[PDB]
Paper text:
As we intended to emphasize structural differences emerging from amino acid mutations, we further narrowed our database by pairing each peptide/HLA-A2 complex with at least one other in which the peptide differed by only a single amino acid, either as a substitution or transposition. However, in the more common instances in which mutations occur outside of anchor residues and do not strongly impact peptide-MHC binding, T cells that efficiently recognize the wild-type peptide will have been deleted or otherwise tolerized. In these instances, an immunogenic neoantigen must possess structural and physical properties distinct enough to promote efficient recognition by T cells that ignore the wild-type peptide (i.e., the single mutation must result in a peptide that is “sufficiently different” from its wild-type counterpart to overcome self-tolerance). Deployed against a set of HLA-A2-presented nonameric neoantigens, the network not only permitted predictions of immunogenicity, but yielded testable hypotheses about how the mutations influenced immunogenicity. The utility of these models is found when comparing results for mutant peptides and their wild-type counterparts, as the models can indicate the types of structural alterations that impact TCR recognition of a mutated vs. wild-type peptide/MHC complex.
We developed a rapid procedure for accurately modeling large numbers of peptides bound to the common class I MHC protein HLA-A*0201 (HLA-A2), which was applied to a curated dataset incorporating thousands of immunogenic, non-immunogenic, and non-HLA-A2 binding peptides. Yet for a peptide bound to an MHC protein, the impact of features such as exposed hydrophobic surface and charges are determined by the peptide's conformation within the binding groove, as well as the size and position of the various amino acid side chains. As has been noted previously, nonameric peptides bound to class I MHC proteins adopt relatively conserved backbone conformations. Our hypothesis was predicated on the notion that immunogenicity is influenced by both peptide binding to the MHC protein as well as TCR binding to the peptide/MHC complex.
Author numbering:
A (entry chain B): 1 to 100
B (entry chain A): 1 to 275
C (entry chain C): 1 to 9
The structure:
């Protein structure tokens, strides 16, 4: 059956400023079927309190979801998004870049 | 400007794991305002925008009742579609449904939609005239004949041209501050030395609504479409959107490159240049 | 608001 790979973007809601409260976003879109596992990572460890938007889909029927959590960026803390899906043989990890 | 209202329904069978999943969401333009989740505790249609919260108990009780009637139909549809295609009970399958209406700048009916998909492919859809059906394969034609005999398109057309646009207008007036707004993009550039003889120029657009936007780069006025990295427009999570476009420029050529921003919230298109 | 009639496939 139809299987489409998720596109992954990891980014902050506001421009990253060290010491200022923000939201870390991981946006997964373009995927099919709907089962997908998304985790936000702080220095390689899974963040517990992560929320996500309500499952919706684009005109071509592929799904999109926004996972997000409050965070205060620092100079040294590294963040990333870890996504697993039927189209991925192993989890795909995208590192957060504050000018991407 | 023009406006739309859309409802999206997802139904996923869960063999051995009980009832199928069912998620419904409603949108006005790019703003979600209602949702229903079969796995959530409330078993109600729930508000997702502040301007829909003033709707009283009758609205919520009626939308809850109707959304349950959508859920029950999709629960049956999964079994029915499984039979049409001679599929086993062991596999999970997906049904999606979308319908809604478009209004133009005069806020009168412009277009109506009702689309249905099985396992990621078009299954059956109402044609633009809101009177005939487009059926993808042989199985879909059995549904088409059933819906033609039951005059399903006649009732859908009345909903799409009547109820749908009337309540769209009501939502637009009630949520005027949220739905009749435009947030212009806040724009800036970044410059990152990749190596010693080329650098990445990235044109940002932030905090804009609605999602529609055009971000392009030019070199000496010539479009750089094949040489521009363009990310998909993405939600900020606060109801606005983000997008950037980047180009790799040889060092000393930054002055040749212009970034162009077209968005409804701008008084006129932007031309940006690293200088 | 939702449509009140939902025909099964």
């Amino acid at each position: 059956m139809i299987q489409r790979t998720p596109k992954i973007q990891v980014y902050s809601r506001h421009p990253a400023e060290n010491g200022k409260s923000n939201f870390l976003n991981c946006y997964v879109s373009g995927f099919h079927p709907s089962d997908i596992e998304v985790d936000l990572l702080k220095n390689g460890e899974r963040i517990e309190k992560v929320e996500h938007s309500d499952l919706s889909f684009s005109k071509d029927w592929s799904f999109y979801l926004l996972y997000y959590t409050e965070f205060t960026p620092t100079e040294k803390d590294e963040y990333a998004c870890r996504v697993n899906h039927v189209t991925l043989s192993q989890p795909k990890i995208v590192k957060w870049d504050r000018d991407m | 400007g023009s406006h739309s209202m859309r409802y999206f329904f997802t139904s996923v069978s869960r063999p051995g794991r009980g009832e199928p999943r069912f998620i419904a969401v409603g949108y006005v333009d790019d703003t979600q305002f209602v949702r229903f989740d079969s796995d959530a505790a409330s078993q109600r249609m729930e508000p997702r925008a502040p301007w829909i919260e003033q709707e009283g108990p009758e609205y919520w009780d009626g939308e809850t009742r109707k959304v349950k009637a959508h859920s029950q139909t999709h629960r049956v549809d999964l079994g029915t579609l499984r039979g049409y295609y001679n599929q086993s009970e062991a596999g999970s399958h997906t049904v999606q449904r979308m319908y809604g209406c478009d209004v133009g700048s005069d806020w009168r009916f412009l277009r109506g939609y009702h689309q249905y998909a099985y396992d990621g492919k078009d299954y059956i859809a109402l044609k633009e005239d809101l009177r005939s059906w487009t059926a993808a394969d042989m199985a879909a034609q059995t549904t088409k004949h059933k819906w033609e005999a039951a005059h399903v398109a006649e009732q859908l057309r009345a909903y799409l041209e009547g109820t749908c646009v009337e309540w769209l207008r009501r939502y637009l007036e009630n949520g005027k501050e949220t739905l009749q707004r435009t947030d212009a993009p806040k724009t800036h550039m970044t410059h990152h030395a990749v190596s010693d003889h080329e650098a990445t120029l990235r044109c940002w657009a932030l905090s804009f609504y609605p999602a529609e936007i055009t971000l392009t780069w030019q070199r000496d006025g010539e479009d750089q479409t094949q040489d521009t990295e363009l990310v998909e427009t993405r939600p900020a999570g606060d109801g606005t959107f983000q997008k950037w476009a980047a180009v790799v420029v040889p060092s000393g050529q930054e002055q040749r490159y212009t970034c162009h921003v077209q968005h409804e919230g701008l008084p006129k298109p932007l031309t940006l240049r690293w200088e | 608001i939702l449509n009140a009639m939902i025909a099964k496939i």
